[PDB]
């Protein structure tokens, strides 16, 4: 179970980003009950998650290239 | 075009914030013109219409004035401050989204 | 017990991912398959008749097919407590390493283990139990090299 | 805690406001008579105490009536007059109340200045947390 | 505690015997041919480190330029001698 | 409606009659 | 998960500070309405309960007034300043923690 | 929950301005013998209310 | 108890009787 | 090691905070009388010592009552009046307390600036490579 | 070679203690003077920066030593 | 111990490691070339 786990990770990241986006969209239209500090914190958490994801992607692709560029 | 729409929501929000700021500045500048009617727009419905050529509404007066001037001061000043803060909030949200999109390509 | 925080967890996780290529593939899983494929290619009498990229891809596919039971067991014993945050890494590392060492012990050789024990002045005992990492890995490496050449 | 300064200053402000209110009430009732149920009006003062949490804020436990004798004024035409035809006018020291108001105002301003300075210092403190 | 483990001292004791062992591997291509991948050949030195990198009786002073040139010239001879005789 | 809200049509003119006819 | 748990306490402290600020603003704006009781919340108990709508309770009156109002200006101002400073401190702590979590990825 | 502060403060400002206007009108017409229709002038004053949709800003009900 | 603390119940309404009932 | 500056500045900040707190308490209770159990309030001062462990930061040894003469007010109409009708008033100098407050604030700001500068220099040392 | 493990555990404990102290101060009970918490936060940040720099330096050294060509 | 001292020690270790690795790689490359050539 590798591709399934990777797709689950991507699903979680995209879901968090979508939640942040919809919360910001709900706030900017004037719906009560949404806090500016709350939406800012959620957006920052989403950005941190995306940065972690891209770091993992870079590490994995670098390892793949290093391990498959060698000559047997 | 997907990028176009995804940034377009916030871009249109910012544009409408700028228009409302301009109208607030206009009714601040003309605050002492007799026979003037306070003007404003409904941000939520206007944004909904634009997402799915701008109409403006007359602000409800609060106190009578003989010279025919209905633009209050305190209410519109609070509106000006709120609009400026929300414009800055939209600006920083758009900037964060753009930077997050950009740094992925690094 | 206690455990360290998210920042250092991420740091050690990223360092482990950096160390991932060599430690889990070269000395643990399939160093023999690529060697035997190279031997077959040299026996064919034509250098690089199949592309090295295709040889490595086939080797990796066969490796994952073979290790799928063991990899699945490791995934269970690691993620299942860790995903729900029930245990700490200080024991999770041991719990995830024990099945791998148990699998590798069968592939190792008693003579190699004994020689490395003599070199590293470790307790031989009549019954094998928890061979140290310093001894187990080189024995597996040399046994795999020997069987690959055979 | 570096934050009990606000509590100390707030307690000082509340105490000074209480004392000023008592002084103002006495000045308003300087020449009153025959309050509720007919009992003569009597002046009141406040007592400041410190909250030994050492060093602590100021509090006012209770308002204490003055024991200075009331003024006895001969006027038999008032039903409050006793067998000697005397009415009991309240004891109010106008100069004392003026001095008390001045002192309360000065203490209030000093405390508000201290609050201003400490608020500036505390605002500047957080710049090192980044 | 913010402290050091004298990384410079460990450098010339924790990895000095590595050059000799790797020299023999290069000097023994019959026991380890080009059929064995170069990548693993690079890892052949580091796999034996886990047994030889830690505390070993043979230790000495650090090396730089003059000290390194003589010791490296002498130490490779042991690897060269053992490999070819086999 | 409530003062400070928004409405579709403008406010009526304001007059200060010195004496009602 | 772990990321949310690392920041839940600071985020909830920030939110409760904002709510208490709103309560203080309301009961300082109603300083002249007779019959209006001062309101505030028990911050420690609220934070502990939320980390384990919003409960609010009346304030003990300081001095009596004939109209019925029971708000003390100096006390409200001191509470306002304290809550503002603590909100700023919480924001700074959250920002520093997020900056460190971001920095650990390089 | 932080954008309602502007609404609360603006409501307070408007209510205080209305009260000040009423006080100024009373001071100006302290000695008005009659109005337009003929009835004598009568002092006016505002009546505040709690503008809760629970507490919020202040709101002037009527005069 | 001490003024400025937190209470769960409101104080009784205030009144200033001109004359005792 | 440049790290002990954090300890030194933290000690300095603690000492300045305690001095400011004492001065503020004196200003608040300048007019106070009849402290708990009847003893009149007395003005308090702090003492700064060097926390040598050569040279080092500043700590507060203890708090000592000032030995300035204690004021008296002639008010027989008070239960606290002594045999001569004198109520005891604490010896607090408002100008002195305000000057102490200002000096403490300035020193606190200077020390936090020192802390920020040392933090920046240490981060630079970290990013030397 | 568990000394790096010990060092990272110690720095993690330090920063966790700083976080605990900050939480205790935000709880609204008097034990903290708003200066010790900030000083501990700064020290924890500096220690974490030192740790990540050490990690970067060590992984670079490992990359270089693995990049050898026998 | 001093932070500047530990940073300098890390730098020294890195430089020495680089020097040793480069010398060894040059020597082994020369030996491999000698072996390859007849």
Short mmCIF file of C-alpha atoms in Angstrom, two decimals, chain D residues 2 4-5 8 12 19 47-50 52 54-58 103 111 113-114 117-118 120-121 124-125 127-128 130, chain J residues 17 20-22 24-25 27-29 31-36 41 44 98 101-102 104-105 108-109 112-113 115-116 119:
data_model
loop_
_atom_site.label_atom_id
_atom_site.label_comp_id
_atom_site.label_asym_id
_atom_site.label_seq_id
_atom_site.Cartn_x
_atom_site.Cartn_y
_atom_site.Cartn_z
CA UNK D 2 4.75 42.17 35.67
CA UNK D 4 -0.10 43.00 38.76
CA UNK D 5 0.92 46.59 37.99
CA UNK D 8 -2.55 47.85 41.53
CA UNK D 12 -5.86 52.81 43.20
CA UNK D 19 -13.24 58.81 47.95
CA UNK D 47 -10.48 54.28 55.17
CA UNK D 48 -7.74 53.05 52.85
CA UNK D 49 -5.98 49.75 53.51
CA UNK D 50 -3.31 47.76 51.70
CA UNK D 52 -0.94 42.14 51.91
CA UNK D 54 4.71 42.69 51.07
CA UNK D 55 3.44 45.15 48.46
CA UNK D 56 -0.14 45.30 47.23
CA UNK D 57 -2.98 47.47 46.04
CA UNK D 58 -5.31 49.68 48.03
CA UNK D 103 -5.87 65.12 46.68
CA UNK D 111 -1.82 56.79 38.68
CA UNK D 113 0.50 58.62 34.20
CA UNK D 114 2.07 55.51 35.76
CA UNK D 117 4.32 54.60 31.12
CA UNK D 118 3.96 50.94 32.06
CA UNK D 120 4.35 51.79 26.76
CA UNK D 121 7.02 49.60 28.37
CA UNK D 124 7.79 47.55 23.71
CA UNK D 125 8.50 44.31 25.60
CA UNK D 127 9.19 42.98 20.21
CA UNK D 128 11.79 40.42 21.36
CA UNK D 130 9.93 37.11 17.35
CA UNK J 17 10.52 44.91 37.02
CA UNK J 20 9.09 49.34 39.14
CA UNK J 21 6.53 47.26 41.01
CA UNK J 22 7.75 48.54 44.38
CA UNK J 24 4.17 51.74 41.77
CA UNK J 25 2.94 50.19 45.02
CA UNK J 27 2.71 55.60 44.69
CA UNK J 28 -0.61 53.78 45.02
CA UNK J 29 -0.43 53.55 48.82
CA UNK J 31 -2.13 58.24 50.98
CA UNK J 32 -3.01 54.90 52.58
CA UNK J 33 -3.09 54.51 56.37
CA UNK J 34 -3.84 51.86 59.01
CA UNK J 35 -2.58 48.79 57.19
CA UNK J 36 -3.70 45.32 58.28
CA UNK J 41 2.13 51.48 55.92
CA UNK J 44 9.65 50.18 50.85
CA UNK J 98 8.08 59.03 39.62
CA UNK J 101 9.54 54.74 37.59
CA UNK J 102 10.98 56.61 34.61
CA UNK J 104 13.30 51.78 35.58
CA UNK J 105 11.36 52.04 32.32
CA UNK J 108 14.19 47.97 30.98
CA UNK J 109 13.96 49.21 27.39
CA UNK J 112 15.55 44.44 25.98
CA UNK J 113 17.35 46.22 23.13
CA UNK J 115 18.80 41.22 24.21
CA UNK J 116 17.57 41.79 20.66
CA UNK J 119 19.93 37.54 19.47
#
